């Protein structure tokens, strides 16, 4: 629930070639882009800064710039001891989540080769067992550097909650707006003779939660597969609900859409 987090992806090809990308997301709307060439931060929304002053924004930007510059070099330095096999990928995600009831929880997680590597709780080692031996090794070394751990703890449990509250309050207008969902119907080639598929597309809605059901009057017809809620530029969502049925029973069927933006005025599409 409204978990602001920054993410980083580093790809190491050879002993001297490595790329790094980063971005800060509110929930799934990208807020901060990162030009790693010049090491600058792009604020993609007017309220990307929250209530933070520009000075602390510059401080945070410089901290992230130095970290981005140095991460690849340090990983290359230690890959010999850690027996990394090239090429490989290192992913990281760190941020703070606002649970319902005003309980902000901070988190940090890392992964190598798509497998979990480590995490922090109360600013400490948690080597995930998937990372195996080396995992523990790494974080053990990381324990030694007190300054890095202090910076991580400060950014996690002292700055992230402040920033999250700031953006949630500042971006109030954009966060809690409502847009009516468009909807339409289409046919689909289904397996089996004397068979058909009905697809109810609902698009352009926000916020994400939505209830779409293929119903025969009020019979509450089952067998409705709801595909994953695909994203869509302009910051709305799209979703197709499919139903398989033999030909002939198509009459008396309708897809019903309930969303917060409709304030109880449900959408009914007859077929």
């Amino acid at each position, epitope marked *: 629930p409204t978990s602001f987090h920054v993410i980083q992806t580093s790809s190491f090809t050879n002993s001297t070639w490595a790329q790094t990308q980063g971005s800060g997301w509110l929930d799934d709307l990208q807020i901060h882009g990162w030009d790693s060439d010049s090491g600058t931060a792009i604020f993609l929304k007017p309220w990307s800064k929250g209530n933070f002053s520009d000075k602390e924004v510059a401080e945070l930007e*410089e*901290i992230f710039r*130095v970290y981005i510059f140095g991460f690849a070099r340090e990983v290359q*330095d230690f890959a010999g001891d850690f027996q990394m096999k090239y090429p490989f990928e290192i992913q990281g995600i760190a941020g703070c989540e606002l649970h319902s009831g005003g309980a902000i929880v901070s988190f940090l997680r890392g992964a190598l080769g798509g497998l979990d590597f480590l995490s922090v709780k109360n600013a400490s080692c948690v080597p995930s067992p998937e990372g195996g031996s080396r995992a523990q090794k790494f974080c053990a070394l990381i324990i030694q550097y007190q300054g890095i751990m202090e910076t991580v703890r400060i950014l996690l449990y002292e700055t992230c909650p402040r920033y999250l509250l700031g953006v949630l309050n500042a971006g109030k207008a954009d966060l809690q707006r409502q847009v009516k969902p468009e909807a339409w119907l289409s046919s689909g080639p289904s397996p089996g003779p004397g068979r058909l598929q009905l697809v109810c597309h609902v698009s352009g809605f926000y916020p994400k939660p939505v209830w779409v059901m293929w119903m025969r009057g009020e019979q509450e017809q089952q067998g409705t597969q709801l595909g994953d809620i695909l994203p869509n530029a302009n910051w709305t969502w799209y979703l197709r609900a499919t139903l398989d049925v033999a030909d002939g029973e198509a009459a008396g069927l309708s897809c019903r859409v309930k969303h917060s933006s409709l304030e109880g005025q449900d959408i009914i599409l007859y077929w």
Partner: T-cell receptor, first 113, second 118 residues
Framework: KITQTQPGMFVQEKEAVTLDCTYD???????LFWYKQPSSGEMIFLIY??????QNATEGRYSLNFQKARKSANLVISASQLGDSAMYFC????????????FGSGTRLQVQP | EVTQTPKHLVMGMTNKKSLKCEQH?????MYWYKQKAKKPPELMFV???????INESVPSRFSPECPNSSLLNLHLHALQPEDSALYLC??????????????????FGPGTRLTVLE
């Protein structure tokens, strides 16, 4: 910012002088440095005290009077010699700061024989 | 130690000169400081991992450059009389290489007394 608030200090030879340096940063987890610049110009590192080190760092003839609560850490030179006549700066580096030193106004010290 | 040749420099308003700072301790980060008359040093540039990380609104006449990892030049051209001061180069460790002690002390070099003249 760091305020030395001292025009210049004078002290007889073979005595102790307490150079003052008061900072105003409310953030914890920082690092306090002292640098000496003789008349030639080069800056010579003197001593360093971490914020959390819970101990007044001592090195050679230079001691420290770091009081975190009062936001002051006065460098203490014991048994001052004639070579200790130089510019003295009190820089501070923060954990979430500029990643580079930030010097105060500095205080001239002129030990006399 | 850090070497900062040339130790002295007298320049006109159209000449082009260069300042070379070189350290062989292989620290990581390098800095450029400018100190005026009877003033604390002021930061100018910071190079972390041979990449410029801080530019404190320095005008475009100064053109820093870090070719190697143990070298940091500074090219000047068409300066102005107010740009006469003492320029110091500093070096310091960075993370994961300075060891357990995360002091990151800065070691300065013998500054260059640049006095420009119209």
């Amino acid at each position: 910012k760091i305020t030395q608030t001292q025009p210049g200090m004078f002290v007889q030879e073979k005595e102790a002088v307490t150079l003052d340096c008061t900072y105003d940063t409310s953030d914890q987890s920082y690092g306090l440095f002292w640098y000496k610049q003789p008349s030639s110009g080069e800056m010579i590192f003197l001593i360093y005290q971490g914020s959390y080190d819970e101990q007044n760092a001592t090195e050679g003839r230079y001691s420290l009077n770091f009081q975190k609560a009062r936001k002051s850490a006065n460098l203490v030179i014991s048994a001052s010699q004639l070579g200790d006549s130089a510019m003295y700066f009190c820089a501070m580096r923060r954990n979430t700061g500029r990643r580079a030193l930030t010097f105060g106004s500095g205080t001239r010290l002129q030990v006399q024989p | 130690e850090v070497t900062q040749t040339p130790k002295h420099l007298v320049m006109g308003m159209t000449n082009k000169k260069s300042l070379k700072c070189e350290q062989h301790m292989g620290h990581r980060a390098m800095y450029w400081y400018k100190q005026k008359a009877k003033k604390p040093p002021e930061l100018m540039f910071v190079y972390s991992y041979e990449k410029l990380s801080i530019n404190e609104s320095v005008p475009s006449r100064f053109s820093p450059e870090c070719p190697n990892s143990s070298l940091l030049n500074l090219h000047l051209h068409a300066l102005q009389p107010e740009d006469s001061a003492l320029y110091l180069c500093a070096s310091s460790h960075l993370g994961l290489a300075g060891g357990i002690d995360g002091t990151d002390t800065q070691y300065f070099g013998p500054g260059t007394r640049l006095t420009v003249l119209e």
